[PDB]
Design a protein around this nucleic acid. Sequence first.
RNA 1: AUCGAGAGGC
Lengths: 102, 196, 264, 49, 141, 160, 559, 65, 114, 86, 133, 49
Amino acid sequence: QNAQRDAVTLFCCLLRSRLATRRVLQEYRLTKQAFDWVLSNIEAQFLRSVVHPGEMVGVLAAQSIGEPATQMTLKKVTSGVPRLKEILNVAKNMKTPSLTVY
Amino acid sequence: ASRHGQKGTIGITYRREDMPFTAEGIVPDLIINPHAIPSRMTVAHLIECLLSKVAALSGNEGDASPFTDITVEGISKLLREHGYQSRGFEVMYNGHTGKKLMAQIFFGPTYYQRLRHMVDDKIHARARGPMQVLTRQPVEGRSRDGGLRFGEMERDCMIAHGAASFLKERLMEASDAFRVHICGICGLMTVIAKLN
Amino acid sequence: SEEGPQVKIREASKDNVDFILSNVDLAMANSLRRVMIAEIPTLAIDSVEVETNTTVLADEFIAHRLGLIPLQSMDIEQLEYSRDCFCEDHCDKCSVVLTLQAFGESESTTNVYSKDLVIVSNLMGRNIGHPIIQDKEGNGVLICKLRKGQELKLTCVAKKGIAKEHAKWGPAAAIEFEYDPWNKLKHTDYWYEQDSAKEWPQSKNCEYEDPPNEGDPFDYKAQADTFYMNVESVGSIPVDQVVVRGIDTLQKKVASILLALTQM
Amino acid sequence: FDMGGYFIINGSEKVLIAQERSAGNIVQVFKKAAPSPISHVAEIRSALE
Amino acid sequence: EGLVEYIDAEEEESILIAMQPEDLEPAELDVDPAKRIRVSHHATTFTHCEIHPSMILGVAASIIPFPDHNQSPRNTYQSAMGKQAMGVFLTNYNVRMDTMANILYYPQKPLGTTRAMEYLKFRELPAGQNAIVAIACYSGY
Amino acid sequence: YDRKVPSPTGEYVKEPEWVLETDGVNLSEVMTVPGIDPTRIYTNSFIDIMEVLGIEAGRAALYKEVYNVIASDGSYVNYRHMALLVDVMTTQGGLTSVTRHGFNRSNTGALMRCSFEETVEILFEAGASAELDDCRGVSENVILGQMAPIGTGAFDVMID
Amino acid sequence: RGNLMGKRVDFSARTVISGDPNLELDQVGVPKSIAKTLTYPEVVTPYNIDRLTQLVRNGPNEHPGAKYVIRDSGDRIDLRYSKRAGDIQLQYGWKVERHIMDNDPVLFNRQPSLHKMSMMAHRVKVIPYSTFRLNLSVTSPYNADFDGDEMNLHVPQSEETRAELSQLCAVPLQIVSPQSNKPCMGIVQDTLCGIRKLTLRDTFIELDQVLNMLYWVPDWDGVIPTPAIIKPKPLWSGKQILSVAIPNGIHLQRFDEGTTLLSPKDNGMLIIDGQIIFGVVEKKTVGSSNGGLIHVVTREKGPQVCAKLFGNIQKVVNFWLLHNGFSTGIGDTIADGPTMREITETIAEAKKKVLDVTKEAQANLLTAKHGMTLRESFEDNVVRFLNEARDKAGRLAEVNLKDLNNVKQMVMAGSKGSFINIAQMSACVGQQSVEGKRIAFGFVDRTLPHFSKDDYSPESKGFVENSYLRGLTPQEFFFHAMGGREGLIDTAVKTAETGYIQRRLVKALEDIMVHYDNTTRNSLGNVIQFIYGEDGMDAAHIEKQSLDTIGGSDAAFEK
Amino acid sequence: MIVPVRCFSCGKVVGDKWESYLNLLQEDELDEGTALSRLGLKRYCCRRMILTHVDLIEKFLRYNP
Amino acid sequence: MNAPDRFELFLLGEGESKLKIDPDTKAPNAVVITFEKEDHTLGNLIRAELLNDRKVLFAAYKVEHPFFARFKLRIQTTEGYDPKDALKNACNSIINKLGALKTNFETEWNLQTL
Amino acid sequence: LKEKAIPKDQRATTPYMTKYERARILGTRALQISMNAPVFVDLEGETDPLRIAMKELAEKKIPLVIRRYLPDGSFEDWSVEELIVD
Amino acid sequence: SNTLFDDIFQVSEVDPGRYNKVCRIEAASTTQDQCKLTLDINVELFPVAAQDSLTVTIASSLTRSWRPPQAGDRSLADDYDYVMYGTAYKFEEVSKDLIAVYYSFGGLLMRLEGNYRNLNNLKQENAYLLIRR
Amino acid sequence: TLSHLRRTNTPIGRDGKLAKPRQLHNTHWGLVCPAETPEGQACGLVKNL
RNA sequence: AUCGAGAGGC
Ligand SMILES: [Mg+2]
Ligand SMILES: [Zn+2]
Ligand SMILES: [Zn+2]
Ligand SMILES: [Zn+2]
């Protein structure tokens, strides 16, 4: 249940921000039935938005990163595909080692 | 293709009736999309179009050689001297309806080339054809009536979709499926089985 | 004259007619020129049986050339479609047989014009299958060239068809077509750099209509009812018959629609 | 219009493609990488003509 | 007669090439705005002059009309595709028994010709046709 | 850098600040210098960060660097995917590379490992160590031509 | 890697592709040859025995036909060479390997398969000609083009396989991709330029065209919308007619720069219940954009409604465009005399600034700014000056472009074309570069043997003040070519490096599956995450919404 | 490789005109523009059929057998 | 290799009726006619003529695929007006105008010299 | 192990039918119907086995049961009847 | 089914914008210096000069598929010169008892402000605009 | 045929990320065609005179 | 079947 509250924390922040009493009654003008309808739709859309078990999210991640890297095209730092190759292959001898000091 | 990397295939064939036409009655042999123009910046294609128009009207040659003092402005002066719009545009009427196109159209002679790639020489299809000898997999190649490769780069996508049974079929029922007998003690296919 | 559409011929020739179509809606003129292009029937070679070919061209090259040759089709209506007739392959009521045999006799190069075609089959007295010849020197279209020692022996069978099946059956070519030289209809938006007027050439048909007043507002309810056409014929059918037969073919299509409605 | 410049081996026409190499008997000087124990090198590729 | 010379890559290190013989005319304004911008050479100690700059191109590139108005990758693409266009590859095609041959029925010489086409014999063995092209949106096909 | 920070009134406002950009990395030393903020300093050498600030800092800087290589090209990939990549590189002890020398050395079966690179050597090492492949990996079943435990084959189906 | 992890397979086909504006999104144009070549095993049941007998009697040589029949005994029966190919007695439980027919599920693919959206289920439409045909709006997920690309088709062989295609790999499902949490398909070039032109406030349509468009929308209610203008002539607006494609129940609100609710330049977009109120429709509205129209209609209405939406928008806009017309020409690359003059005067002022900074560097009067050499300072300054000149001339050009300029229109719609394309084609093509620097001294202390030694002039090191319209001088030509070569090499090399990287990513994370307890694990069960994405949501149906709590004065927050 | 019968674009027969064209160039020593005009070839669709033509057949004839 | 025989552009086959007629759904007094082996030449003219009959509410045609020679014409008329009668009247008006065109043209051509 | 079941009350897996198990179930039923197996719905003019299975689903007359497996080996049996479809 | 607003306005500022057949015209009420409006007008059909005075009217009638005027029998509700049909999308509460309404006639917009039309212009899809010369 | 007869190969590598040998070099002016070269792999290695 | 070369799409 702690993990549950943690997972839903941020979306609940958005919820309370949007379903704030003075907002519901002054910014929107929701009626009773309209409010309960918003509630049911929210819960339904949430439950539908949950990820489905069985999803092979690993291949999905790999493809979702590799595809836009195939369109990675051409002012001081190694960027793009050379940088990505430096990152994945753990590159101890990187070409633009920098340090940003605040 | 044309002589400027503007390559492409034929999508449709229209008879002269359905083709758009100018008041002179002239009809395009070819129709290419304006959207292939600005992304490649192949201005020479359009200059060629303009020059070829003025040459065909003049019965002279088109000095499309590079590093010359031939300008678009002089070409246009000539073309207008021949009674056409200087930038090469022409009012054109729809072929289906015959109402003027609200847009005037760039339209003229341009050298095009027929490339060595043709569909009936690329087309292939196979369903349970010849198999290879060693792997017992489909043979490689159209000229041998083989099967396309279901590469692992595609097995990846089939996994990301989640289609387990389609993947097994592509891997067993559509290629080199086989059945062997194995011993419940030594887990190796060394069993001699008279099925008859 | 007859109440309805109005015609006024500006110029007329054996090969082309420049006229005006008044009190007509656009769709009619457009379907008329579409029919004038595709739906009107003529006669042209649709089969070739080749016996000897020592020429530098392949057989199919020559066959494609022959199909394109203009043949007389004035009386084509009295000839029937081979698909419609009852013969085995072709007859005299459905097809015309030409023959072409020439030999490279002379040391100099020997041409083969369309005039060298010989009509074998029985015409049964109709203006049909005559290779069209408008050349000043009487020769036809240059079909092939022969060296001393080459010959060519073949038999063409001309049938009846329309340009839809193949463009060889096209009775006309290059139908000029314009309406509203002044764009009073606001049917096209002129692309320009400085002045659309000075940057677009005036149409020749601007003379036959009065220019508008710059202060007069847009005549919005006016529609297009006057057309400037110029129909040119290769010669397989005279221009007058090209346009009249197109009119009648259009009418015949509408008629078939009527009859099918009745059968329903 | 034939231009020649090809051979005819067993019916098939063959072309000899120009093979590109660096010229020998010329002296070139090349720096060495940072982790190299030696600093520079002078090389000449002595070839008997 | 000493009017022309053979210069290789090494020797041209020691020379100053002019581009057009007009670069040797003296100078002592009202110009055509449409022509390209050619900088004054500002050099005088010339030893040679290019025969014609268009000669920096290969056989294939000398087919491209106005390659000075194109993104160079397009010129490269075309130089790779011009070797795939059909046409009369030889006048004796009917005699040669080649594994594959493709001949254009009615080849046309282009209406836009490079001066270098004459020495390439392209107007005598063309590989395309002057198609009437319309750039237009029409049915979206 | 024109960074944003809350005004005392509460609304965010742009407050620029001077920042130092170097041409080299020794984090353990630069960190302990006076006059700096030892809580906001940053490196593109995420491996030095794993060395100094622990493994989770490494995860965070790793994700940040991948995010930047994507967003440099104006593109955008959702958080979860880069997250999964970074976590996989970090879920082990420390930084595991996506190479034959990194991930391919784990105990993740034997047929799955041989399917990437160095195939016959993996198979020899397994035949020596008497490895027992679980046959629960994807590539194991793909090789065996069976329905792998994937979204559709992630369970059984039976009768009521 | 060549016979186990991937192999050649039966029931496959491959050929060229072209596009059909009259095909559905999930539809795929299958040539009749291939349909006669590929088979599906269908079992005989009371529901099919009539159709299956008809197909067997129809024969393998003409479609819809069948090729083989499989009895209970298990002996194959070849319909090409058999006495009894006419009098067939189909018994229940037999198998007819029927032809591929309309609305069959096929897997459609284009290599390189970088995507789940690169292998997608399609509905079969058997077509006459020899090319594969697909909807324009399905190109972007495949990265396909009609310049010679070829595509592959695989055919399922069991009912569960067809089910896995239709219910998981179908096209409308994969509209919103989990990658980038947005739609991967949108309205594209022709339809895009046309939908812009149509939805202009200046665009009115007469009755006849209106009725033809109305009928063109398939799932049309059959109710003519009340015209916008009535009195002098009953007229509709391009907006009004296009709104018939949008399903009722759709709200879309978006504000651009200076988007008053009066929107004097038709900015933004306001669409109320399948009818639009104001806003020119363009790429931002109807592209494959986050929070676009496709995002909405897929989330609210669903996948199939959005696929029909693709179809209807395309059909209406393509009709209107076909009867409207569009072209490019070179006249859309000419700026007028005064603009060209200002452009060349700008190039001259940039040349003067470069000359001045060069002379200053020559007199050793440079300030050695920390961290960089004198030469590095010099090169940075001159490159900056020339880029500023190119950009200023390009904006000088784009200002002079009129609204009728079709290049400007394609840019405005977002169909194709960018500012830099305009700048280079008409204003100035720019500075050429190799390995990040200007044209290097390949010869001894010069770039070309037409230059005096030690000439750091703008053009001597690769600056092209001439435009593609004007024409490049031979040195400019050679330098441009020198840069383009680097470009082609970088492309050809990035391709292979990305292929390797992608393969390694996939082979590393392949076994990562979200299990039933939401724990993201691998083959060994070793946990990689405890909540997928740390919130356990699918990457699709996730949208960029604002958090009104952050930001704003505490005063306004309290208020 | 030989004069096409008619223009591809419009269809006006041109095959009957080749030998005239050449003679209009050689007999009358005209230029190709006026020569094409004299033959009723006004549309440029027609004009390019003759102007861009290459009678390769004259080479093919030179091969003896 | 896959091209259809060109005669299929005008040549009906295997009981393909020229006209097929279907009542429209959710449309009072409306009907859709599927013309077979015809193109814009006919449909454009029939529709533009139906637009002149003041008792026609709706009239439009469409070619669902240029591959095929066929098209769809939907007509909605007033109550008590079988649209087939509107189609007939339009067609007959077409034919009358065409006959008058032919006669006037022949008049002008025989009047014309050369 | 030996009877590693889970009591039907203390079940924490999703009560909703995942798209993957839905597609697998529909495919299994369409397979059963491809062969002559009985159909438990009044097919209102439906022939395609897939649509028949989908309608058997909407009326929840599909007598199958999913066995969701947990990485420890524990599993939960879920009738198609109780599983929610959305 | 009758009129919901009536007034006479004097043309103040007409601007073409980047369009060629449409202008955006801002006008104010006559004899009343407190109520004003802006509106998109097709100038090709109905021209609008500066400082004109055009009678402006809004009606709610005079769902069902549109049909053209069959004959003169159709009794128009419009002896005016320029008529349009649109939808109200916003009612702007400008100030205390100062209201404004936003209309869209297929993209041609309208903004109207005042408070002598309050009791009439409801949130109705139904809306007709009429202009007498 | 001509382009094939004026082709040069540079065998220093078949597969590798070699940018320097491939790029168009200043010295190639007038001797090698700047643009005519294969696409993709072996770009800039195979040249035409 | 092995090896080699050329080409297509990114
Ligand atoms: Mg491509
Ligand atoms: Zn044993
Ligand atoms: Zn007969
Ligand atoms: Zn012509």
